[PDB]
Coordinates of C-alpha atoms and ligand atoms in Angstrom, one line a residue:
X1 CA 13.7 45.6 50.1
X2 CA 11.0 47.4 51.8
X3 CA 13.0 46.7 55.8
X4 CA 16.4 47.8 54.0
X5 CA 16.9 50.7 56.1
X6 CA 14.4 50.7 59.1
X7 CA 15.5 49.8 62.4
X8 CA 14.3 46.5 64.5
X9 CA 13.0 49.3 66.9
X10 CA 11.3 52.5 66.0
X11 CA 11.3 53.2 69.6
X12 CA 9.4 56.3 69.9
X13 CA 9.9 58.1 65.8
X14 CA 6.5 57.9 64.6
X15 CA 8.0 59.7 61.4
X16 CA 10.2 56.9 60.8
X17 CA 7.6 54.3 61.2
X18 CA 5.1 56.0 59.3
X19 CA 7.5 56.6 55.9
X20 CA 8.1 52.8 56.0
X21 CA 4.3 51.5 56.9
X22 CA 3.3 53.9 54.0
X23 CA 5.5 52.0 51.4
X24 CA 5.1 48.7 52.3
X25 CA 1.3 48.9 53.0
X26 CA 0.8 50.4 49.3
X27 CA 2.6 47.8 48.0
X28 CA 0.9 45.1 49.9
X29 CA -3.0 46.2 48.9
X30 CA -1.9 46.2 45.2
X31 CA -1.1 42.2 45.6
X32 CA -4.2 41.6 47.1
X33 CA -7.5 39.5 45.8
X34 CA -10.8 41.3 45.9
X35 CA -12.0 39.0 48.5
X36 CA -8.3 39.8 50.6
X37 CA -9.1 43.3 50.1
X38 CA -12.8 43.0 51.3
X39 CA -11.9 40.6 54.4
X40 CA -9.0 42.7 55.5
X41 CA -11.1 45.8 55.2
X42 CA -13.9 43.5 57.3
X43 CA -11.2 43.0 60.3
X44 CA -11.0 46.8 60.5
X45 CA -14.3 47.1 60.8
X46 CA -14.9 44.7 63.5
X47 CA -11.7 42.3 64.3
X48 CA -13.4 41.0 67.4
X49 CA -16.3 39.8 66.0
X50 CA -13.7 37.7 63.8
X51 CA -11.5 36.8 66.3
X52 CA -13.8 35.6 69.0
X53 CA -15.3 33.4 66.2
X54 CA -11.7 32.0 65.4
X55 CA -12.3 30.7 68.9
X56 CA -15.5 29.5 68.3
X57 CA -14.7 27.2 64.9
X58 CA -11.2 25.8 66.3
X59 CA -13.0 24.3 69.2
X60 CA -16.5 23.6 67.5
X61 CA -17.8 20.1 66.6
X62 CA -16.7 18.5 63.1
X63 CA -20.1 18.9 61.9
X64 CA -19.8 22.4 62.4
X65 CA -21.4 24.9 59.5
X66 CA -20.9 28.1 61.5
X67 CA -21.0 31.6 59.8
X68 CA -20.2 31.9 55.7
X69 CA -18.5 34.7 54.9
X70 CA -16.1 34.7 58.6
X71 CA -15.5 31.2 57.0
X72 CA -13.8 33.1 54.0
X73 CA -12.2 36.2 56.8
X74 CA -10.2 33.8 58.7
X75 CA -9.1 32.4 55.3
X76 CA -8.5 35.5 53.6
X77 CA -7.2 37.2 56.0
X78 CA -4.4 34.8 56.5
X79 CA -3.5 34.3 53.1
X80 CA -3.5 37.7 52.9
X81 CA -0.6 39.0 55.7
X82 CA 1.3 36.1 54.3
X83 CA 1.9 38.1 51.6
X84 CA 4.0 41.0 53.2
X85 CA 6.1 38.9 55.8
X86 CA 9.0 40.7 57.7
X87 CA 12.4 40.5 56.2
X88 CA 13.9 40.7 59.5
X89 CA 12.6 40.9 63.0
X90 CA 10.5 44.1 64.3
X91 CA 9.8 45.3 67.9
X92 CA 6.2 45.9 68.0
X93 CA 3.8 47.6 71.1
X94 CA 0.9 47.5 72.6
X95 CA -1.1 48.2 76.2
X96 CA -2.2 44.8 77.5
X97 CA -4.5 43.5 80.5
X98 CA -3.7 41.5 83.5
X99 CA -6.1 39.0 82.1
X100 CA -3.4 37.6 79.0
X101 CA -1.4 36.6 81.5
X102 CA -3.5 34.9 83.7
X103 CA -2.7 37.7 86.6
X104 CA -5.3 38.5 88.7
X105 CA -3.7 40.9 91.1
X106 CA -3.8 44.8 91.2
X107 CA -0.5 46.1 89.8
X108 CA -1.0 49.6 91.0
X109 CA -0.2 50.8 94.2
X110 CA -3.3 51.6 96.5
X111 CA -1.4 55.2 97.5
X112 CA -0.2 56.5 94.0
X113 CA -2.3 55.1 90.8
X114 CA 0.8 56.2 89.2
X115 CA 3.4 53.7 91.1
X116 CA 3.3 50.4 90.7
X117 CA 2.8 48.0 93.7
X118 CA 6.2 46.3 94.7
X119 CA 4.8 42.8 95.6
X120 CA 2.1 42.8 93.2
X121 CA 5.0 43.2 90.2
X122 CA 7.3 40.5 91.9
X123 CA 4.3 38.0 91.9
X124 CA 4.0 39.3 88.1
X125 CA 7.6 38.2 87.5
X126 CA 6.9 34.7 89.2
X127 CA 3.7 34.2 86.6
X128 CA 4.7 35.3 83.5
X129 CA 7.8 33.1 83.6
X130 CA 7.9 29.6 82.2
X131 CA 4.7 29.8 80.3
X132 CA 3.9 30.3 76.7
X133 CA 0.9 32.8 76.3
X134 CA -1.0 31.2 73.0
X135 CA -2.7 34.3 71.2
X136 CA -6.1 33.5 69.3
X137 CA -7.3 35.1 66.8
X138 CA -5.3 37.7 64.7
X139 CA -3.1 40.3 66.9
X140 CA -3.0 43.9 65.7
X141 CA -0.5 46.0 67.1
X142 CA 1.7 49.8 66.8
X143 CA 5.0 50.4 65.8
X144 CA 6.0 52.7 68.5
X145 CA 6.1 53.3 71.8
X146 CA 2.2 54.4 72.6
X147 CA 2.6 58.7 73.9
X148 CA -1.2 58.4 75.3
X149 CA -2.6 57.4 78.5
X150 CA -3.9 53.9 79.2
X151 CA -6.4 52.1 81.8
X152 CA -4.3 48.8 81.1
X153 CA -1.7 47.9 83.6
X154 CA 0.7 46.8 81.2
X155 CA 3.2 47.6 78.1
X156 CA 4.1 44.7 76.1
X157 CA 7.2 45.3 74.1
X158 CA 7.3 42.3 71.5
X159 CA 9.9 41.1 69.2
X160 CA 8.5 39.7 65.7
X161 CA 11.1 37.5 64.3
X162 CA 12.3 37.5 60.5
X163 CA 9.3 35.9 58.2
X164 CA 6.2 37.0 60.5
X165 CA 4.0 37.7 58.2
X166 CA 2.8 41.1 59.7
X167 CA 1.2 43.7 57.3
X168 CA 0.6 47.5 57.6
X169 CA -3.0 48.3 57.5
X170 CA -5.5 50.9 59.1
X171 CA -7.5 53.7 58.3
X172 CA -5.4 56.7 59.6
X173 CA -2.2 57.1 57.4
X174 CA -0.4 58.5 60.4
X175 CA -0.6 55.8 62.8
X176 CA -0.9 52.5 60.4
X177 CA -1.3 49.6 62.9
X178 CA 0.9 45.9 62.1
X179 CA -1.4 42.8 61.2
X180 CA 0.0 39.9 63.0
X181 CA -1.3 36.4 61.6
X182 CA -3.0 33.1 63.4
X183 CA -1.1 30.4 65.2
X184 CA 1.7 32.4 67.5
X185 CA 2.4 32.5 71.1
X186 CA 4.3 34.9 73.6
X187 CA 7.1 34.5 75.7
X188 CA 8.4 36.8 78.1
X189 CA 12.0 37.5 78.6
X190 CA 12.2 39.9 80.6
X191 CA 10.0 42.9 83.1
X192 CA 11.1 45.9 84.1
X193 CA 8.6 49.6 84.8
X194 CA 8.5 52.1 82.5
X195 CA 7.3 55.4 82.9
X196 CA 5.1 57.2 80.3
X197 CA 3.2 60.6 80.5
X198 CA 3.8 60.5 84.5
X199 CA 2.5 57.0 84.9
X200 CA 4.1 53.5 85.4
X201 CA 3.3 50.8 83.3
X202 CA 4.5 47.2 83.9
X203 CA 6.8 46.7 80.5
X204 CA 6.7 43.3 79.4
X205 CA 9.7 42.5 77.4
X206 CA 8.5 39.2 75.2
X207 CA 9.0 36.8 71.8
X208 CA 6.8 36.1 69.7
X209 CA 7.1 32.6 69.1
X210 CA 5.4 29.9 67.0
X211 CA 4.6 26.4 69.0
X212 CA 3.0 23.0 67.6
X213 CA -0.6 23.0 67.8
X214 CA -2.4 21.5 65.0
X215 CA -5.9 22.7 66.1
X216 CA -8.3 21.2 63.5
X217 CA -5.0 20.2 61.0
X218 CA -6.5 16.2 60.7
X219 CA -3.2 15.8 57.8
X220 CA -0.4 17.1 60.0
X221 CA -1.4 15.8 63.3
X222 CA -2.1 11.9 62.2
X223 CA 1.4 12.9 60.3
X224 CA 2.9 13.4 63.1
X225 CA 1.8 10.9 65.0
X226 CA 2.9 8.2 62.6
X227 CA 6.1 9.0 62.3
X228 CA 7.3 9.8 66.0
X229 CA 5.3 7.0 67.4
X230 CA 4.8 4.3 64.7
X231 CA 8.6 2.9 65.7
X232 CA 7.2 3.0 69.6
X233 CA 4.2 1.1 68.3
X234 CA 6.6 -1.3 66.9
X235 CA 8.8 -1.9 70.4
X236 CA 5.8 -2.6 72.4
X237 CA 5.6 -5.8 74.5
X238 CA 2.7 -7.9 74.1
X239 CA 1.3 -7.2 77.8
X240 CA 2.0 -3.4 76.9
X241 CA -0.1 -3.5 73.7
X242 CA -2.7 -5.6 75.5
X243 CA -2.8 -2.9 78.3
X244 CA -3.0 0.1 76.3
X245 CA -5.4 -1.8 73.9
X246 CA -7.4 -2.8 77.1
X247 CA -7.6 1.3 78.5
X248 CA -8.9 2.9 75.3
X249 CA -11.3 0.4 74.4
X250 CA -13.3 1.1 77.8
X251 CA -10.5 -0.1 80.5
X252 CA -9.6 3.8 81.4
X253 CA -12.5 4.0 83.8
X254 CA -11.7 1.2 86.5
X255 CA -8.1 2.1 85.9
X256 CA -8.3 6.2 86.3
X257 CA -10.8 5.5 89.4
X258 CA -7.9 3.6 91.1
X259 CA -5.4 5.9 90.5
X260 CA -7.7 8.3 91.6
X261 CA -8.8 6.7 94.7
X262 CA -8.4 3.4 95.4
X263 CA -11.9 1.6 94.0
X264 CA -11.9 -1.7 92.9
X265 CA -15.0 -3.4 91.5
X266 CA -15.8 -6.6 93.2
X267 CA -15.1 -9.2 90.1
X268 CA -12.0 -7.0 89.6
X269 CA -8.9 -7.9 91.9
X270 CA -6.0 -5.4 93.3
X271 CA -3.5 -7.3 91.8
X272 CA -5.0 -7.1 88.0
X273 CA -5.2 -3.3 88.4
X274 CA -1.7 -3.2 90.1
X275 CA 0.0 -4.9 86.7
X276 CA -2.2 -2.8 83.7
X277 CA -1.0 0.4 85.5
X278 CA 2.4 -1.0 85.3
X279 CA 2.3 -2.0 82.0
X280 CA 0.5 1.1 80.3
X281 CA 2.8 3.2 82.8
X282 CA 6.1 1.4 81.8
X283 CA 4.9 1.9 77.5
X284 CA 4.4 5.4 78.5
X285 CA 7.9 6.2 79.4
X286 CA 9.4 4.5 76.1
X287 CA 9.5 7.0 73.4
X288 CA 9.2 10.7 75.3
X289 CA 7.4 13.7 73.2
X290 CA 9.8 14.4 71.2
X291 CA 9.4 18.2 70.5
X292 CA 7.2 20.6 72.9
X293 CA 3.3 20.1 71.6
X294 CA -0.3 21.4 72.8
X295 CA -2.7 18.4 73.2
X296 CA -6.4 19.4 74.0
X297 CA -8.9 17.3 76.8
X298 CA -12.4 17.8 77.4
X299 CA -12.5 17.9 81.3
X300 CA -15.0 16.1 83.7
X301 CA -16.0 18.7 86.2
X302 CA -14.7 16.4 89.0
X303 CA -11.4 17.2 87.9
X304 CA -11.5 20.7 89.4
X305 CA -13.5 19.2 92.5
X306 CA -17.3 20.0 91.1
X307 CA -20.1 17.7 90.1
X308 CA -22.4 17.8 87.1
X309 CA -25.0 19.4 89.2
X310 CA -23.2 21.6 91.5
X311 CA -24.3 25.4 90.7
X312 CA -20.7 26.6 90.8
X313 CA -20.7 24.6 87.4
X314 CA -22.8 26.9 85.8
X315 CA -20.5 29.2 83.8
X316 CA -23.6 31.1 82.3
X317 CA -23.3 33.1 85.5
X318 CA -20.8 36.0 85.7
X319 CA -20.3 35.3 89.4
X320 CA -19.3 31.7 88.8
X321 CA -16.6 31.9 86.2
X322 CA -15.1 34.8 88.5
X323 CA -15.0 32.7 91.5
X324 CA -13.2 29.4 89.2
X325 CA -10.6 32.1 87.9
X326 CA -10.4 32.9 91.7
X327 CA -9.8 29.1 92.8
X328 CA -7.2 27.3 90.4
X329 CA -5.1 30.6 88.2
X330 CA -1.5 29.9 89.1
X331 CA -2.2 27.0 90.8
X332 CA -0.4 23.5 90.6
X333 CA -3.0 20.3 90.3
X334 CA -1.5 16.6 90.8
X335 CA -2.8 14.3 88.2
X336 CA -3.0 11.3 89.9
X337 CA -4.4 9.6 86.9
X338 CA -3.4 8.7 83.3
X339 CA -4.3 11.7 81.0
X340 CA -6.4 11.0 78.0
X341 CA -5.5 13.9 75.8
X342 CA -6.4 14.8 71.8
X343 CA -4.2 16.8 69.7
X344 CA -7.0 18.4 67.7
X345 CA -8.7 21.0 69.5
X346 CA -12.2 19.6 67.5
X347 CA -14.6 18.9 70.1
X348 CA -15.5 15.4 70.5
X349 CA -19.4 13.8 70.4
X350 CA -19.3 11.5 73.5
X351 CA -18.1 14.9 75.2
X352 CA -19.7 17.0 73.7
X353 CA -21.0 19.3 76.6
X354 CA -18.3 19.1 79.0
X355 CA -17.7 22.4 80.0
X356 CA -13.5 22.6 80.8
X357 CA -11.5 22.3 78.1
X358 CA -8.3 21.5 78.5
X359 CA -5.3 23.5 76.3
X360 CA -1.5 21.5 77.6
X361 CA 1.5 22.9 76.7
X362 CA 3.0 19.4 76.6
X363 CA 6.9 19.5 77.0
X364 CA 9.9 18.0 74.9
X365 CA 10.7 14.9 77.1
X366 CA 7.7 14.1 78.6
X367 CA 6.6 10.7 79.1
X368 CA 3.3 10.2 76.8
X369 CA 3.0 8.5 73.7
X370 CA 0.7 8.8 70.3
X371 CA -1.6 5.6 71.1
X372 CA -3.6 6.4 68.1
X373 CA -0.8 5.1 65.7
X374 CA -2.1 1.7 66.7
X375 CA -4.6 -0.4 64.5
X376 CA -8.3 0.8 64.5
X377 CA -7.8 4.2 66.0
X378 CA -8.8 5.9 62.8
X379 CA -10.2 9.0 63.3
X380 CA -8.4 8.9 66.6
X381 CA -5.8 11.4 67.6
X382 CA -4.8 10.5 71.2
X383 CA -1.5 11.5 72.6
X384 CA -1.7 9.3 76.4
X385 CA 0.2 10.7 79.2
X386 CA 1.7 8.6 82.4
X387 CA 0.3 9.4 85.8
X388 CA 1.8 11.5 88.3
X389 CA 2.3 14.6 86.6
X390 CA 1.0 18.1 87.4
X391 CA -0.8 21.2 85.9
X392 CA 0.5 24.5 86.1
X393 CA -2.8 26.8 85.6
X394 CA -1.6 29.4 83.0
X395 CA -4.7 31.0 81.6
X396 CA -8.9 30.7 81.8
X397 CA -10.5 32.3 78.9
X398 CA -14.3 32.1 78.3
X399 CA -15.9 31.8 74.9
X400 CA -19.7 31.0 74.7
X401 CA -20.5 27.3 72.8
X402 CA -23.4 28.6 70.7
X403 CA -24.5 25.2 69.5
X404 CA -27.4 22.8 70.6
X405 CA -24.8 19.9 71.2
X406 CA -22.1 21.4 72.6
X407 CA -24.8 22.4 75.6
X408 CA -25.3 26.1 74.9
X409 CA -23.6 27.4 77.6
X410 CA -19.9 29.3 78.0
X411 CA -17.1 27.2 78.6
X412 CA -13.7 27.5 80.3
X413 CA -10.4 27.2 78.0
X414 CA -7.8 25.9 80.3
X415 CA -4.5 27.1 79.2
X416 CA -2.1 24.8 81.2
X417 CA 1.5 23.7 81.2
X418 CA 2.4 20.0 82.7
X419 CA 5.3 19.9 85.4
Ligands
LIG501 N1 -11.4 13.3 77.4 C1 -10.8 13.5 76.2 O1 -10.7 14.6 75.7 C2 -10.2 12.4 75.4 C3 -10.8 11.1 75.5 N2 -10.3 10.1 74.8 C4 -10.9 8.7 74.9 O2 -12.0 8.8 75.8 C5 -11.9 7.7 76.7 C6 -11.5 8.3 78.0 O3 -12.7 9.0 78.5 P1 -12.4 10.0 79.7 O4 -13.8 10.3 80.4 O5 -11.6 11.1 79.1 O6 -11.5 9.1 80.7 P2 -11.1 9.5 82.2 O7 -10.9 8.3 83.1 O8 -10.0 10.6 82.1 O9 -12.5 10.2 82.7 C7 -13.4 9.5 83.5 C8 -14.1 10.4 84.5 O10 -13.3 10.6 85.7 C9 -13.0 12.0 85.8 N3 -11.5 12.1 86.1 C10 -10.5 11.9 85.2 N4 -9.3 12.2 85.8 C11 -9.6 12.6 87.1 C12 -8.8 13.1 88.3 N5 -7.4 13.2 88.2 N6 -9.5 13.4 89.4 C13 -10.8 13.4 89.4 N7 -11.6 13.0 88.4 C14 -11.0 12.6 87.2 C15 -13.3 12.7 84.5 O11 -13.8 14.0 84.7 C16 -14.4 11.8 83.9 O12 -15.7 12.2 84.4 C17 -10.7 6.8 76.2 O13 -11.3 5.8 75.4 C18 -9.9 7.7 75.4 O14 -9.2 7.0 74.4 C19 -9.2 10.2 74.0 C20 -8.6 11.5 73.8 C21 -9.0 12.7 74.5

């Protein structure tokens, strides 16, 4: 009842938004738990602190403790929203920076700071398309169209669809900002400049959209797995399920190598080589991902061209995750090899300190399979993908792995889409 007579768009009425925040966010505090109460009130207090941490836990190890009481937040917080979900969909604002959408080009003009630069917005159109933008961590936003000046380049204009769950909250009663929960992404559809108070903003028109990502969901994944590939399991030849067998049980390295490169071990022949790729290759293109999916990797450095001990590898440095972000945003990578990817976004103990983590938006009919459906891959969660594909670099966000095993040091989050 609360939406019955609000538009989708409050455009710019703040009076309008503000009669039906009021309403609905009254409503909403008196169904809350003490502890929803107390976490909501701690993500006004400091909701990056949470956030950032959100981060943090999703990619931890499984032994992870972390912190208590942002334990109970993330929990609370997202049981609590759930509680005041839209009834039908709601356009939603807020200023945004170039670095959400993996743009690193000025969008101002270098003559007027309040004109946008032609080519720098048409390369904007080119990057924002075909991508999914995964948001982490909670996303707070305004009902209107901001009337103040901002030192972000960009205006998103975002369309919450029916059943968000997206609750009023904030500490002035006059400008009540929308509580968006975990787990969504962004997709433009369309760009265009607006003008406010003198100066041009780049407006990004987008969706907010909810993709398959099971992040540390152990139940739904392994679910998941079972039933979409537990019939491919089934169809396998015997050389096929030898093959695959063969490359997760230790095979991958001699394999990937050869893909890579060309290097065969002395005891090992061409020929051998020649017929597991074909095999594993030809198992790979039987059952294709059925519906579009994330899948996680822990990178080797060689993969972006570094070694272990080159000091470009060390992320610790300002100056070196600048100069990464510099090298491979928007850029397409072959993948020459097979790609050994986990749908759980846990970090993994035999990889424990790899720095790159990889975060695929893997696409309805791509060839990969769920190998892990096979016999004694408990506790694995592999989705394998054929060779020859390619990454489209989306996104590089930095968080910092505080823990001793992880290898105390920041690491890269690799948003990517394969092509
Ligand atoms: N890495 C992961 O996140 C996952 C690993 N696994 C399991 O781990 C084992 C595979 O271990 P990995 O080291 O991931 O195998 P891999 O063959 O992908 O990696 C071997 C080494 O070669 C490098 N490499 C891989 N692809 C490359 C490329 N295109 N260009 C240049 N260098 C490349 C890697 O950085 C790594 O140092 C398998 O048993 C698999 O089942 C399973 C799921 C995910």
């Amino acid at each position: 009842m609360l939406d019955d007579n609000r538009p989708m768009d409050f455009a710019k009425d703040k009076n309008s938004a503000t009669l039906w925040a009021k309403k609905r966010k009254q409503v909403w505090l008196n169904n809350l738990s003490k502890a929803e109460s107390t976490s909501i009130n701690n993500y006004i207090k400091n909701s990056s602190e949470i956030n950032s941490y959100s981060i943090k836990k999703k990619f931890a190890l499984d032994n992870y403790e972390g912190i208590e009481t942002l334990n109970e937040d993330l929990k609370n917080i997202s049981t609590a929203v759930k509680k005041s979900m839209l009834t039908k969909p709601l356009y939603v604002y807020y200023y945004e920076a170039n670095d959400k959408f993996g743009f690193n080009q000025n969008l101002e003009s270098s003559l007027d700071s309040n004109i946008i630069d032609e080519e720098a917005i048409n390369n904007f159109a080119k990057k924002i398309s075909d991508t999914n933008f995964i948001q982490d961590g909670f996303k707070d936003v305004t009902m209107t169209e901001p009337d103040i000046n901002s030192k972000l380049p960009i205006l998103v204009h975002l369309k919450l669809p029916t059943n968000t769950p997206a609750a009023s909250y904030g500490n002035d009663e006059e400008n009540l900002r929308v509580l968006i929960d975990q787990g969504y992404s962004l997709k433009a559809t369309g760009l265009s400049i607006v003008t406010i108070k003198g100066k041009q903003y780049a407006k990004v028109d987008a969706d907010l959209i909810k993709q398959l990502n099971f992040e540390n969901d152990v139940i739904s994944a392994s679910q998941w797995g079972e039933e979409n590939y537990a019939p491919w399991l089934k169809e396998l030849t015997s050389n096929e399920l030898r093959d695959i067998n063969n490359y997760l049980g230790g095979g991958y390295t001699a394999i990937n190598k050869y893909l890579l490169d060309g290097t065969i071990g002395e005891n090992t022949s061409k020929e051998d080589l020649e017929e597991k790729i074909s095999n594993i290759s030809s198992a790979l293109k039987k059952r294709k991902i059925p519906e579009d999916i994330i899948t996680y990797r822990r990178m080797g450095p060689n993969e972006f061209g570094l070694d272990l001990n080159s000091p470009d590898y060390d992320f610790n440095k300002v100056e070196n995750v600048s100069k990464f972000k510099e090298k491979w945003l928007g850029k397409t990578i072959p993948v020459k090899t097979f790609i050994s990817t986990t749908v759980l976004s846990n970090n993994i103990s035999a990889f424990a300190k790899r720095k790159l983590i990889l975060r695929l938006h893997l696409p309805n009919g791509s060839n990969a399979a769920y190998v892990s459906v096979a016999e004694g891959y408990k506790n694995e969660y592999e989705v394998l993908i054929d060779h020859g594909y390619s990454y489209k670099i989306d996104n590089i966000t930095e968080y910092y792995d505080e823990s001793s095993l992880g290898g105390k040091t920041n690491k890269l989050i690799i948003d990517a889409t394969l092509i």
